[PDB]
Design a protein around this ligand. Structure first.
Ligand SMILES: Nc1ncnc2c1ncn2[C@@H]1O[C@H](COP(=O)(O)OP(=O)(O)OP(O)(O)=S)[C@@H](O)[C@H]1O
Ligand SMILES: Nc1ncnc2c1ncn2[C@@H]1O[C@H](COP(=O)(O)OP(=O)(O)OP(O)(O)=S)[C@@H](O)[C@H]1O
Ligand SMILES: [Zn+2]
Ligand SMILES: [Zn+2]
Lengths: 603, 266
């Protein structure tokens, strides 16, 4: 409140402020020596804690060269010795647009665990993927919503990672929790172990031979000299199945909670700020909404989302105009005041692509015992495991639609050439030199089309190198046109199109990466002001991005708000929390910053 | 000083260029044992000529990607070997003589070797190296097998290598263009763009060649090094001291003489 701050500043508080620092230093040093004064020491401790929080509260909505700011340093000078005597990386600085439409700076506290989790390599990879996704294909209007959602996902990741971190019914729970946390910690280690076991099993299978005689009926036996390969194969297969099972369990205990949290978050936001099942009521096409209908009335709908008051919020949002009893029936809440939820959660899990892939890996691992060569399908995991192979195959899969369409075009044009050759060139397609059994491969539309699509596309010269030479014939001049047109159009152009598509995919991915990097290094992520503005002072842009508008600082502040009790929020903290509740991202500085507003005072 | 000499020789023996020259000497010595060992000295054209270095830089720019795509080729050919071995053993008869039937897919190692060699080294894949499946139960499966082999291995998995090389050429070329553009649009020392200096005619050229010439900075640093410290002037002593503590604040960053004194100069 502007009035109260200036009333306190223009009073005798500051004279009374220096009545304690003298005490807070000398009396503390007096009481520290005697071990019997610990309780009085702690009383003075929380007394000065209240004092310092009051002083911080006085510096709320501060303006550079303001009356309160200039008055504080005077008091600091008058009692400097007491400050030095009382005194004898974690600070988080962000800038918001406060209720006064003026940029303000907020300082808070960051714990060591949060920073350590932020510097973890997997969190770094998630941040890089999010940055690329937003910069490449994103909108400026919805950039802040995506950023806040990513921050929420990162905070939930931090929470579950901290939960799983490790520093007859009684022992059962302890052993089960320890086992599950051990699996969750080493999910990627188990994935790599499964991949290595796949290579080992395939290498063992590389020593296979087949014979009619025991190691017509065919016997499937592995032949080698050492004699130790079959016990190794047996043990490795029974170990690989167990490893795949452990991988699925670790995925369930590690990555499923993120999916459940995201689903509950989107459902709660749709219920509150959209009225999906209140107004929209999707008919049949939104299968996601159709399956989400079953969780509305569950007693524990927001189990993972930290929004337990979502039912009350949606009630206050809609019931006053829409009705009270129907909302209670829909949400399954008693106004006076869990098989279905488990079914919904399992249905959500079974829709997830990664869980399905792990289930398919387990299925093939099980079937590998029926036939050992089913373990060869696990080498496909190298595509989804290694980043380099993913980036290489991204060039192929970037233009998958175009590749399919050009294959269809190849099929159509070869069908046209088949029609022409079948109607005019049936004689030449004699693949048998024996006059006893003339083998015509173009006396049938299906056979001629198969012959064309197979050999004329699989050959280097087209179809003129697979059929009879038309020299010394009536249709020689027509056949030389036919074969050469086939060559030029199908073999040359219609197979250079595929190579051009792949090369253009490589180029597009490379220039997308370059564009994302250039945009990141030339503009600020939060405010969008270009680096040319900040480069007036030396290292201005670097300092701005790393300290003033660090997105990591914004994530840390949002986590700080989430894990802090709402009753203890300060003015700016309460304002930002309220703006969070209504999902208004106006407090993010857009086009403005602290130094831009106060250039005159800073220069 | 035996220990210092030992350390110096250990440092020398780690250097790549000295090792390359030692290997050249070793092959030169062995060429007397067998004259054809002198053929390995033609590899020196790669490390000698600048043009060959630039040409081979396109190949070596994506060496990791090329190795990884060769490994992917090996894996996919192994998969096709597994399928053909479990279902297409009959067709891999490379001997027409009935007396000695030569099956090249009755063994996993032999079939994998046959695939990796001829099916990748042939223009049509593996359908042009084995028996024609016409008039057979598995004809419709074999035509899918050979054509998938062709499309995936021969076409796509060898166009990936060409695309990698072409993208390497493009990346090197655009890197050179970007370096040139950055050099000609901004000052190396202060970073102020050429648009500021271009108000006066030839302003950027004069600025770079005289006011903020990096050659002049190197000459000044050499002048400080070879001059006696007792004879340093005020600015010389200040710059020498800043050199001692490795503080590069004296380099003008974002500021220059004309920018500060525009009012007096204009
Ligand atoms: N709000 C922002 N927070 C952080 N970096 C920003 C921001 N806006 C722009 N940038 C720029 O983003 C660039 C890359 O971000 P960095 O913080 O350097 O992280 P990084 O280099 O991508 O990867 P690491 O391993 O975390 S250092 C920097 O050069 C910053 O100048
Ligand atoms: N501090 C700097 N010193 C020299 N050139 C600079 C500097 N800052 C920017 N440049 C620009 O760098 C460009 C290339 O440098 P030049 O001095 O012209 O040398 P060069 O053309 O690369 O090769 P040569 O053979 O030495 S002329 C020029 O167009 C300058 O404008
Ligand atoms: Zn900014
Ligand atoms: Zn300059």
């Amino acid at each position: 409140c502007t009035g109260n701050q200036q009333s306190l500043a223009h009073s005798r508080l500051w004279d009374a402020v220096v009545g304690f620092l003298h005490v807070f230093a000398h009396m503390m040093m007096k009481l520290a020596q005697d071990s019997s004064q610990i309780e009085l020491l702690k009383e003075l401790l929380d007394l000065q804690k209240d004092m310092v929080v009051m002083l911080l509260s006085l510096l709320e909505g501060n303006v550079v060269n303001g009356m309160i700011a200039r008055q504080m340093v005077d008091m600091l000078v008058e009692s400097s010795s007491n400050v030095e005597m009382i005194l004898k990386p974690y600070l988080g600085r962000i800038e918001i647009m406060g209720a006064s439409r003026r940029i303000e700076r907020i300082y808070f506290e960051i714990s060591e665990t949060n920073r350590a989790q932020w510097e973890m390599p997997q969190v770094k990879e998630s941040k890089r993927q999010f940055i690329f996704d937003v910069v490449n294909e994103g909108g400026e209007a919805e950039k802040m919503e995506l950023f806040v959602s990513f921050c929420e996902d990162t905070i939930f990741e931090m929470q579950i990672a901290a939960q799983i971190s490790e520093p007859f019914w009684g022992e059962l729970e302890v052993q089960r929790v320890k086992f599950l946390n051990y699996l969750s910690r080493n999910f990627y280690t188990l994935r790599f172990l499964a991949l290595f076991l796949a290579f080992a099993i395939n290498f063992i299978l590389l020593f296979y031979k087949v014979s009619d005689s025991p190691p017509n009926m065919v016997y499937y036996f592995l032949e080698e000299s050492t004699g130790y390969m079959e016990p190794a194969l047996w043990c490795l297969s029974l170990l690989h199945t167990l490893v795949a099972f452990l991988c699925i369990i670790g995925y369930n205990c590690l990555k499923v909670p993120l999916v459940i949290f995201k689903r509950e978050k989107e459902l709660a936001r749709k219920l509150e700020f959209d009225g999906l099942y209140i107004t929209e009521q999707p008919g049949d096409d939104d299968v996601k909404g159709q399956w989400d209908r079953l969780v509305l009335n569950t007693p524990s709908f927001p189990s993972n989302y930290w929004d337990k008051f979502v039912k009350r919020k949606v009630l206050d949002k809609h019931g006053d105009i829409f009705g009270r009893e129907r909302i209670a029936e829909l949400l399954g809440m008693d106004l006076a005041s869990d098989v279905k939820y488990q079914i919904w959660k399992f249905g959500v899990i079974f829709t997830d692509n990664s869980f399905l892939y792990l289930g398919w890996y387990m299925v093939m691992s099980l079937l590998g015992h029926y036939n050992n060569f089913f373990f060869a399908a696990h080498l496909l995991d190298i595509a989804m495991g290694v980043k380099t192979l993913r980036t290489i195959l991204s060039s192929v899969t970037h233009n998958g639609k175009q590749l399919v369409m050009t294959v269809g075009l190849l099929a159509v044009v070869v069908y046209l050439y088949t029609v022409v050759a079948f109607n005019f060139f049936r004689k030449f397609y004699n693949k048998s030199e024996d006059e006893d059994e003339p083998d015509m491969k173009c006396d049938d539309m299906m056979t001629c089309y198969l012959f064309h699509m197979y050999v004329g596309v699989r050959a280097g010269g087209g179809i003129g190198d697979e059929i009879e030479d038309p020299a010394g014939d009536e249709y020689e001049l027509y056949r030389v046109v036919f074969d050469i047109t086939f060559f030029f159009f199908v073999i040359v152009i219609l197979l250079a199109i595929i190579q051009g598509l792949i090369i253009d995919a490589f180029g597009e991915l490379r220039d997308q990466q370059e564009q994302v990097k250039e945009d990141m290094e030339t503009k600020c992520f939060i405010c969008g002001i270009g680096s040319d503005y900040f480069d007036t002072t030396p290292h201005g842009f670097e300092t701005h991005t790393l300290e003033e508008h660090n997105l990591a600082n914004y994530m840390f502040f949002l986590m700080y708000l989430i894990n802090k009790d709402e009753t203890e929020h300060t003015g700016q903290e309460s304002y930002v929390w309220k703006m969070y509740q209504e999902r208004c991202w106006d407090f993010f500085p857009a086009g403005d910053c602290f130094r831009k507003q106060y250039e005159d005072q800073l220069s």
